[model samples]
Target: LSLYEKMLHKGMIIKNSNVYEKIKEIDTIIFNKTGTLTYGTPIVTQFIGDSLSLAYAASVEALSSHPIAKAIVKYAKEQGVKILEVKDFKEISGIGVRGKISDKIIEVKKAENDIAVYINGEPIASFNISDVPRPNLKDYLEKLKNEGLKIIILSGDKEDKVKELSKELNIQEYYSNLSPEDKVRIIEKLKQNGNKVLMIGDGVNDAAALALADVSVAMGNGVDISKNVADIILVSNDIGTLLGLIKN
Candidate 1:
């Protein structure tokens, strides 16, 4: 079988088979925080308040494509609650989402250290969501590091959280609290310096940078736009497969 066929067997979908030859040129790999290095699906570690309140929040969250929103919706579904129809839904970028359900306003926004669900302006439920790294990622990352490739993490999340993850992964370069535009500029600078960058992400926010990179990869579980823009997609959502693509 050809290399492209081999990659397809391992769950890596290459957009253009030609990318297989060019993969050798990539000297840098940029990762997004939530779903690239970590598992695409986050979990609701803690939930406080009414199940009915959660049902309302989940109804609104269902309309959003963010990983956190998917977690909330998943938790609500697992509890066997009924999700109502929402109207006038709005997702505040990097903040949260809100909508009108049953003639009442329901807002699920970021709280002090958790996600809070508000009903008619009153805080009704709080959820602590957590995203963990891929189980075998650190070892895979170490292999890449040993090859002397530059690895960086760029994220819209808080600096504290980003720093914590980078420390755990043993990656030296990281930038947090970045906007989508900021991510674009960083990739632009690296490209201008003659770096062949490989960007991996799993969100709408990462779409532009994915397009800008020398090569782009998306997680199979990520949103459609990111997958559409990527040069390759890891259908199993495992970064380990990257090792096969990079090595002879």
Candidate 2:
């Protein structure tokens, strides 16, 4: 079996053989914050919304594939709130999602530093969600830093949250509150500077950037478009295997 095929058996899918030849040329690594770096299993650590508001939020959130959306849904379910039907559901990339639930317009969007639910354009509830870094993420990141690679995080989340994670990881460069187009622009600038980049992401928001990178890695649970664009896929969502792939 070919070496790339062999790596597939170990949960790394290398879609293009050219990636293997160029992997060593990757000097900069860009990570998408939410699902790519974190475990993507966020929890509603603090909620100030009523149960009815929570249900409305969850009903709207259930339609999205984003980790923050899923977390709200999970929290509502565990609270015994019934997930209602939504109509006219609309999601704005890098902004928020809104839908008509029970003849009332419900919006769940970024609120200052967290997320809030608005009913009929009136604020009804706010949530403080938290997701931990992946298991052994620090160790693997340290390994990458030791190799002298430029590490950066580009995320749609706010500055404080991204800053906290980057500091914990000891990574020096990070940009937050970025739109999908913004991410693509950043990669383009890097490539223009003659830096070969490897972008790792697990969301629809990261698809464009992933395709623009010298090498792209998508998590197994990533959105469909991201997987379709990636050069490599981590099928088991294990960061531990990352160092092995990079070293090889």
Candidate 3:
């Protein structure tokens, strides 16, 4: 039988009001780290050093694939800053990016003051930002945990930040630096343990595992592929929606 037919046979295609019915049957949930949890927009809130202006900072970040880096660059352009061409760009996955800005080698790191715009290999200026967490996240996660639900954080970020967020949210388990395929494998392992997993994510990288999960939830702001694969779409970007779904 086709996948859709199998899903229908298993009653996976239930009414929207029957979400709790589905949740009651699931054993675990896997969540994405980046935009799903943290504010996806990375703005250059502060600038340091005399050599680096807001324009220079924005120009350097324009070549980055990181969501926050892209946010910073977009914000700069919105403020009328001119962008320059970057030569010799390199991405340090899960950390930051380094490239040549004109004749100087510049590096943009991630942290509160994550972006460090440099010139001639010397430290110049830095930009700082804090991505806003979803409203009622702490309460929602606590409620889930209280219900004896298993929660796992999966991300492509560094272990330190992932662990830090996990602790802040009281999530005891997590996996870091997971590629698309890696996430799928982790889901498979959970299923092998007799756990029916639900995966929630908001990026193209999450498409594979979202398809594999017994139930998948995607943010309204997520990529098209994620929304297409998900069983539920959060119209609002609030954590309460998920909680309400589970409570219903």
Candidate 4:
């Protein structure tokens, strides 16, 4: 039986419900990182450049709860970075953080292990962090590619890390260092190509694009704003489940 027929046989008809209607109309799929594809827990496995201890690293990360910040703190604790209470904290959404460490200002942003540190708002060193790919990611991705669906990766991460991830995942088509607006423009471009697109993401930045896509899938643990605009919610963070939907 055809996919539509199978859905009908299984009593999964697309009623006037939000997701079903959109799912019925979608033809393309786009995904985001930090919680969509990877575990979203970026652990600072190695620190380089400056002679900073785990305590200092944790101190620097204490000001924010962004995924990258959490990863840095978690990794610092695991690696014995000294943990200290930070003061005068301020979080710059979509950017890094700013806080006082002793008498100096500290700022940290997403970078590779080779350059991961800043001293008094000045670049001083770097570190290496690793975010493990979701289990069976390659298998699902390969299946997607074979099916002739356009698979694209969009991220706000640094260019080098984004390119590295693309190479690792074997995704040749991707956009990195994108602002939220940039993501929306890409969706509009896809529509211009006469393809109905599905966007799956976990950040507040994805809200606009989610609204623009023909369908949007949001993770349960994702930002509330994203969930509000999504057509489908994956309760579990397991990305492998996407394969089941594709095959269906």
Which pairs clash inside model 2? none
How many backbone clashes does every candidate have? 0, 0, 2, 11
TM-score, model 4 to reference = 0.73
- Give one digit per residue, the lDDT tens place, for model 1 in 119-166: 999998899877777766565576565566888899987887789888
TM-score of 3: 0.69
| Most accurate candidate by lDDT | 2
lDDT of all predictions: 0.86, 0.86, 0.70, 0.69
Q: Write the per-residue lDDT of candidate 4 for residues 41-93, one digit (tens) a residue.
A: 67666676544634555687776777677877776666655677778877777
Q: Scored by Cα lDDT, where does model 3 land?
A: 0.70
lDDT of 1 at 188: 98
Q: For this target, which candidate reaches the highest TM-score against the unseen true structure?
A: 2
Preferred candidate (lDDT higher): 3 or 4: 3
* Cα distance off (Å), candidate 2, residue 118: 5.8
lDDT of 1 at 30: 91
lDDT for 152 (candidate 2): 88
Query: What's the best-to-worst order under lDDT?
Result: 2, 1, 3, 4
Best first by TM-score, ranked:
2, 1, 4, 3
lDDT of predicted model 1:
0.86
Alpha-carbon error at 91 in model 1, in Å?
A: 9.6
TM-scores for all candidates: the values are 0.74, 0.76, 0.69, 0.73
- Report the Cα lDDT for candidate 4: 0.69
